[PDB]
Design a binder for this molecule. Structure first.
Ligand SMILES: COc1ccc(CC[C@H]2OC(=O)[C@@H]3CCCCN3C(=O)[C@@H](C3CCCCC3)NC(=O)CNC(=O)COc3cccc2c3)cc1OC
Length: 127
């Protein structure tokens, strides 16, 4: 499925070139602008452990999820990954533990050393 395909074929979007954050575009967005560090960004998303059977369903898919890009308000993989998205884009994002919750995890739901998978839709952004 998409997690395996992203693992194998995804683009490495990290500065370190460690394949730690891997991306495949799902739905092509509009224009060429991407959000900038400090912009408010607004998304929809679904996430799971990368080997998980089903996406997590514990948030309201109506409501935009909002954060300030590049400020450490979300896991590192999201600060790197959302920065690459065009408005209206949907992408698949696979994130090794160093770009997610690392050795600590977030117990119980996120174990130690967990690789995560997301689908992210960028709705809008503003400076
Ligand atoms: C700078 O590093 C961090 C910054 C903030 C946190 C707290 C958790 C943070 O969640 C996330 O960053 C990611 C990406 C944005 C959507 C939520 N995230 C999740 O990991 C998912 C998780 C659910 C189970 C399957 C894997 C994906 N969490 C949720 O969907 C539910 N929890 C929340 O959304 C709580 O609210 C947050 C609001 C802002 C940032 C975070 C969480 C953790 C951090 O590092 C470990």
């Amino acid at each position: 499925g998409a997690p395996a395909t992203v693992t194998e074929q995804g683009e490495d979007i990290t500065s370190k070139k460690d394949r730690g954050v891997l991306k495949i575009v799902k739905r092509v967005g509009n224009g060429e602008e991407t959000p900038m560090i400090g912009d408010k960004v607004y998304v929809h998303y679904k996430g799971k452990l990368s080997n998980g059977k089903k996406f997590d369903s514990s948030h309201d898919r109506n409501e935009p999820f909002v954060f300030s890009l590049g400020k450490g308000q979300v896991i590192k993989a999201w600060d790197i990954g959302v920065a690459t998205m065009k408005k209206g884009e949907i992408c698949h994002l696979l994130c090794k533990p160093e770009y997610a919750y690392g050795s600590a995890g977030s117990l119980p739901k996120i174990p130690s050393n967990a690789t995560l998978f997301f689908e992210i839709e960028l709705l809008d952004f503003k400076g």
